[PDB]
Amino acid sequence: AQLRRVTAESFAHYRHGLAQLLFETVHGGASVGFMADLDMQQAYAWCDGLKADIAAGSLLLWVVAEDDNVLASAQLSLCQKPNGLNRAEVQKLMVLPSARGRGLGRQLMDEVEQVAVKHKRGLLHLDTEAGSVAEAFYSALAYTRVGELPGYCATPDGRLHPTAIYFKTL
């Protein structure tokens, strides 16, 4: 199982594995953008909407994989505004339910942070469901908690919940 940065040219190889990861993460209960009715048709559409920012270089995408089998993934959105070059937003960090607790989340974030540094990004920020396993995760990775935004998004079943803002100065 290896970590690879995905390009526009290698995307096709991981597209299916990435849609299944999103699929299992959503139905595992996480708030990562979708509802309980997400099916593979919609996961594929999510994957296809990533292709252009990945080809344009503003969205970096990684996966931890066994060939085409994707066990986890992480993305970094490089801010492109003329006064925001010092920052980037971590998003879509996900690990198959069955492969959790084995350190994959952390192997991804360590890559993300090192590439962030190689792209002169002094600031990494993100938001994630308040009270979720993702909170203890970022905290363990020494990300600082800013606080919450109430009713930020709904859980896959409809319930409104807050998101919690975290950051890391690299």
Cα–Cα distance measured from residue 124 to residue 102, given in angstroms and rounded to the nearest whole number: 24
Cα–Cα distance measured from residue 87 to residue 105, given in angstroms and rounded to the nearest whole number: 21
Q: Which of 14, 23, 34, 137 binds ligand ACO (CB under 6 A)?
A: 137
Q: Which of residues 113-132 bind ligand ACO (CB under 6 A)?
A: 126, 128, 132
Measured from the CB of residue 80, what is the shortest distance to ligand ACO in angstroms? 18
Q: Which stretch binds ligand ACO (CB under 6 A): 2-10, 52-60, 87-95, 111-119?
A: 87-95
Reference 13, options 52, 47, 56, 53; nearest CA is: 47
CB-count exposure of residue 56 (10 Å: 0-12, 13-18, 19+):
exposed
Residue nearest to ligand ACO (CB): 105
Question: Quick check: 140 binds ligand ACO (CB under 6 A)?
Answer: yes
Cα–Cα distance measured from residue 51 to residue 9, given in angstroms and rounded to the nearest whole number: 10
Measured from the CB of residue 58, what is the shortest distance to ligand ACO in angstroms? 16
Give the three-state DSSP class for 56: helix
- State the binding site: 24, 93-95, 101-106, 127-128, 138
Q: By the criterion CB under 6 A, which residues form the site for ligand ACO?
A: 25, 30, 32, 90-95, 100-101, 103-106, 126, 128, 132-134, 136-137, 140
